[PDB]
Write a protein that binds this ligand. Structure first.
Ligand code: HEM
Length: 153
């Protein structure tokens, strides 16, 4: 678990993301899709995309990015008390979307990359560590629901 001081560093860095949710969301998805191409194949909605230029021009992609980051931001602000908001996402991703837990690890690495590139010399190592912990908490809990259903993969 995180300490109050660590949760503060997490929510403080999330304030930068909320200033431009659509922007940070577009950068995250593209970094994920370009770095791990297998993840894009999981989206029937976006699989027609082939180049970064095409991904950059898609308004629908940004629309879903905002949907995703909005849901994530709501979870982080619960400071660990996310049981209710994590259940439906675990059910939908494990059984309907067929998303491996490993992909959750990928998306977590994409967030740290975006924050550093977009905020040069403004994303501290202390904050990076706090964000790491919050994301690992989220993952551990997700995997617990996945295992229950019979997935966890
Ligand atoms: C921080 C990570 C994640 C969050 C908070 C998140 C959140 C969401 C939300 C809110 C939706 C909307 C309704 C639903 O639950 O089905 C959704 C849909 C979906 N998610 Fe995620 N997701 C995450 C990671 C992933 C990853 C890693 C993949 C794939 C590699 C993925 C694939 C999908 C797909 C395929 C859908 C439906 C897209 C569509 O056709 O509209 N998600 N996700």
């Amino acid at each position: 678990v995180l300490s109050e001081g660590e949760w503060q560093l997490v929510l403080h860095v999330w304030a930068k993301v909320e200033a431009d949710v659509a922007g940070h969301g577009q950068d995250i998805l593209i970094r994920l899709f370009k770095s791990h191409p297998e993840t894009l194949e999981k989206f029937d909605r976006f699989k027609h995309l082939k180049t970064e230029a095409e991904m950059k021009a898609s308004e629908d992609l940004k629309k879903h990015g905002v949907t995703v980051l909005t849901a994530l931001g709501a979870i982080l602000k619960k400071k660990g008390h996310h049981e209710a908001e994590l259940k439906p996402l675990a059910q939908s991703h494990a059984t309907k979307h067929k998303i491996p837990i490993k992909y959750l690890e990928f998306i977590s690495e994409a967030i740290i990359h975006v924050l550093h590139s977009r905020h040069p010399g403004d994303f501290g190592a202390d904050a990076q560590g706090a964000m790491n912990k919050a994301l690992e908490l989220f993952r551990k809990d997700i995997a617990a629901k996945y295992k229950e259903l019979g997935y966890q993969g």
